[PDB]
Amino acid sequence: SLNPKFLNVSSLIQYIQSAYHEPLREEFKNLTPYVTKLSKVHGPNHPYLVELKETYDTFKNGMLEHMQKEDDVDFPKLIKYEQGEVVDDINTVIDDLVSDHIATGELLVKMSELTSSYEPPIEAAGTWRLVYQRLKALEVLTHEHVHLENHVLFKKVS
Amino acid sequence: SLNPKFLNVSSLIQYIQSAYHEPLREEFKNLTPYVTKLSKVHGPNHPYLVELKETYDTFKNGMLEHMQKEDDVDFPKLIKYEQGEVVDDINTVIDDLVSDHIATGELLVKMSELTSSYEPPIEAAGTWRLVYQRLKALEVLTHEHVHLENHVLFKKVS
Ligand SMILES: [Fe+3]
Ligand SMILES: [Fe+3]
Ligand SMILES: [Fe+3]
Ligand SMILES: [Fe+3]
Ligand SMILES: [O]
Ligand SMILES: [Zn+2]
């Protein structure tokens, strides 16, 4: 059980990528077909499952583009700033990054509302219950991720 | 709390250095005079105290040179190996580094045995109680330090 205090910016970014980015990206690939099946089968008579599908999709692609910007563009800046080099939009960067976290957040709220905190109705079975199950764990994984970035990584630079 | 398995060999090595190596060095600066003093004072009265001074000093000079071996020659050889460059001598390193861990190992046992189990007599006061506390302190940081290397960093490359 590491103390993050002792991880520098470059290594903490690494941990965030191995523990959160790469695990999230993979799950978004495995879950997505289940989430679309649930909406195609039981959406016809449960419309909220389609709102769930549509919301999950938006949260999903929101994450994936966001991470790409962090990995390929914005974490490199967070490093070179703490590596001394002049990065004059460091405050801009960090601001857009929380704008993104906030927004993905109120999206996770929406999914948690629609599912009633991921408790299936009894008349759910099979896919329906797995979808809820995995989303709940994804909601948890996403909160940890962003809390680590927000309250650890973004404070080492500012 | 953070999971060390997700760090790669180079991020983990940085962690070892900040969290363990640089602390241990700085503590050896601070604690060494007290050991010598407690040995000088109540050491005649009780000789096992000077057995302790000489045992601690051996474990000190040991750790110190062994961490410089890792910092200057062997944590490089491990990074360059994880990075894909051709490092033979790799298991020769991993095997000497545990040769030195197993060493500090049975040595820390003896310091602990010498000093009841870091239990100070009823005669002890001031100097004598600080040293035992700071040693049992130091004794546990080394367990963490050499358990991290042994079962994470070394099992990463192996
Ligand atoms: Fe991220
Ligand atoms: Fe993020
Ligand atoms: Fe070490
Ligand atoms: Fe070591
Ligand atoms: O993220
Ligand atoms: Zn797109």
Residue numbers in the entry:
A (entry chain B), B (entry chain A): 67 to 224
Task: Tell me, in the authors' exact words, what the paper reports.
When first described, ScdA was placed in the so-called “repair of iron centres” (RIC) family and proposed to protect iron–sulfur enzymes that are damaged by ROS or RNS. We now show that the previously enigmatic di-iron enzyme ScdA functions as a nitrite reductase, converting nitrite to nitric oxide (NO), and we elucidate the structural elements that support this activity. Using an integrative toolkitX-ray crystallography, solution NMR, AlphaFold modeling, and pulsed EPR/DEERwe solved the full-length homodimeric structure of ScdA and identified a robust di-iron center that forms stable iron-nitrosyl intermediates. Our findings demonstrate that ScdA harbors a di-iron catalytic center, consistent with its placement in the RIC family.
We also analyzed a cysteine-free variant (C30A/C31A/C191A) by SEC. This CF variant produced a single peak at 10.9 mL, confirming that ScdA is a homodimer in the absence of intermolecular disulfide bonds. The crystal structure demonstrated that the CTD forms a homodimer, with each monomer encompassing a hemerythrin-like domain that binds nonheme iron. Based on the crystal structure, residues H87, H132, E136, H167, H211, and E215 were identified to coordinate the di-iron center. These residues are highly conserved among ScdA homologues. Additionally, the MV-based assay showed that mutating any one of the six di-iron-coordinating residues abolishes nitrite reduction, confirming their critical role as identified in the crystal structure. The dimer interface is located between two intermolecular α-helices (helix 5). From the X-ray result, we observed that residues near Ser77 (S77), particularly S77 and Gln80 (Q80), appear to form a hydrogen-bonding network that brings the two monomers into close proximity. Notably, the catalytic efficiency (k cat/K m) for CF ScdA is ∼2.4-fold higher than that of WT, indicating that the three native cysteines (C30, C31, C191) are not strictly required for nitrite reduction.
